[PDB]
A paper describes a structure:
Mutation of Y242A resulted in a large structural change at the potential active site, with a 3 Å shift of Asn243, which narrows the substrate groove in the mutant structure. Tyr242 in the substrate binding groove is located at the edge of the alkaline pocket. This arrangement, together with our observation that the pocket is able to accommodate a trisaccharide unit, strongly suggests that Tyr242 directly participates in cleaving the substrate to produce trisaccharides, and the alkaline pocket assists in orientating the polysaccharide substrate into a position close to Tyr242.
We show that the FdlA-NTD adopts a right-handed parallel β-helix fold, and possesses a substrate binding site composed of a long groove and a unique alkaline pocket. Here, we report crystal structures and enzymological characterization of wild type (WT) and eight single mutants of the catalytic N-terminal domain (NTD) of FdlA, revealing its unique substrate binding pocket and identifying the key catalytic residues.
Author numbering: 1 to 442
The structure:
């Protein structure tokens, strides 16, 4: 009942068919610039457009090598290597690697998942080729950039009930590793997600070289010269819900926020954010995850984070995004450091909003002197200095349960009120808020 094909040329017709069971024979397949043309195999982008429904595609032992020059062969248009438009499709075990580091002419997304009830399982994806690469988002991630960009993202989850399962996503590109736009009930489960880091001091050492950052005198889009002392990711989000977007389901174009995301048992390493879902609506659930060396650990806005862990070497494990945050319930383990501490944010957590139930657990005995649990106050975060992103800093906290089962100190700012604090040690808790309760525990 399974059709096996032995070339990308013979694969493509099946992508336009419904109810097919297709296997691409074990082997290596190469997509290079010569392969993209009007009379060539890849006439249009997306390269692999899964338009059919109710189909299964097996890519076991398939290595698909896509030369990044392909990202420049479609004019000034977005290039997507893989897009699923149908429903009830299963794609499994493909190994996809972006070859070379050539930047996209405009922008690129390796995999885009529209439709409903699709699953991508067991993929191994390596993302390469973007501009600028080496600065993170310091000189622009959207419009009005200090340095113009050609972003390359990895997996874009849209549609309805679409599922990313047991995948490895390695990024060496300036883009989100895994993100959700206009997605209803997306689920990310069992995935390993990894980017790479670079200190702002290393960036600043480009002074005099004529680098692109050197030529703008390191003036960031946040309004100030790039500060030393921070560790940045070269990628954007690890698992992120975008603000708003467009998806396609059953020939219906839909503009909406992401809603009801679920993230289960994922390890995220060296991204801008471990798991950030504050922009998603509906029920948010994050369970069993590990976040290592990210600039921020967990920021889902509201919902549940349970049985999760983050280390604190490069940024806070937990951040309330806005003062409008409400009903954030979290049980987070501060993991032992995966590398030396280089956390310029001067906080292991920033807590604000109202009606939160927060538990922090750790075995760490050696606490860096700048690391503190903050309830309200002026976070020294890289992107919120000197009034930048003002809704994400300097906001009040009210009616919050804080169970500090850690040796980390707690600072309650004067904008904090009705904070119920239990801690291993209350001697390192400073309270300048209103009607805060502070009880020690064994």
């Amino acid at each position: 009942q399974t059709t096996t094909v032995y070339s990308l040329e013979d694969l493509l017709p099946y992508l336009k068919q419904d109810n097919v069971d297709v296997k691409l024979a074990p082997g290596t397949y190469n997509v290079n610039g010569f392969d993209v043309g009007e009379d060539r195999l890849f006439s249009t982008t997306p390269l692999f457009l899964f338009e059919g429904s109710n189909s299964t595609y097996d890519f076991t032992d398939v290595k698909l090598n896509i030369n990044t020059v392909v990202l420049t062969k479609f004019g000034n248009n977005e290039v997507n290597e893989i897009q699923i438009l149908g429903n009830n499709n299963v794609l499994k075990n493909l190994k996809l690697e972006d070859i070379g580091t050539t930047a996209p002419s405009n922008r690129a997304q390796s995999i885009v998942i529209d439709g409903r009830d699709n699953r991508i399982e067991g993929f191994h994806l390596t993302i390469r080729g973007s501009y600028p690469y080496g600065y993170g988002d310091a000189f622009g991630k959207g419009g009005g950039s200090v340095i113009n960009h050609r972003k390359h993202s990895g997996v874009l989850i849209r549609g309805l009930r679409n599922h990313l399962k047991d995948c490895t996503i390695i990024s060496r590109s300036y883009g989100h590793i895994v993100f959700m736009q206009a997605a209803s009930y997306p689920t990310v489960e069992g995935c390993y997600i990894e980017g790479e880091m670079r200190s702002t001091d290393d960036m600043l050492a480009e002074e005099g070289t004529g680098s692109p950052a050197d030529k703008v005198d390191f003036m960031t889009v946040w309004g100030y010269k790039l500060p030393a002392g921070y560790m940045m990711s070269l990628q954007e989000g690890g698992i992120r819900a975008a603000n708003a977007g467009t998806t396609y389901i059953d020939g219906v174009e839909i503009q909406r926020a992401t809603d009801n995301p679920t993230v289960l048992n994922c390890t995220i390493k060296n991204a801008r954010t471990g798991v950030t879902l504050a922009h998603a609506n509906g029920t948010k659930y994050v369970e069993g995850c590990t976040v290592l060396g990210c600039e921020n650990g967990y920021s889902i806005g509201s919902g549940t984070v349970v049985n999760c862990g983050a280390d604190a070497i490069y940024g806070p494990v937990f951040k309330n995004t806005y003062g409008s945050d409400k009903g954030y319930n979290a049980d987070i383990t501060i993991l032992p450091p995966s590398d030396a501490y280089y956390n310029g944010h001067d906080a292991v957590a920033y807590i604000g909003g109202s009606n939160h139930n927060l538990t922090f657990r750790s075995e760490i005995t050696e606490i860096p002197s700048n690391l503190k649990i903050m309830v309200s106050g002026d976070l020294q975060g890289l992107r919120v200095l000197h009034g930048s992103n003002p809704s994400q800093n300097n906001f009040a906290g009210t009616n919050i349960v804080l169970r500090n089962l850690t040796n980390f100190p707690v600072d309650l700012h004067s904008d904090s009120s009705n904070i119920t604090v239990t801690s291993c040690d209350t001697d390192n808790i400073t309270d300048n808020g209103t009607n805060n309760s502070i009880e020690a525990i064994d």
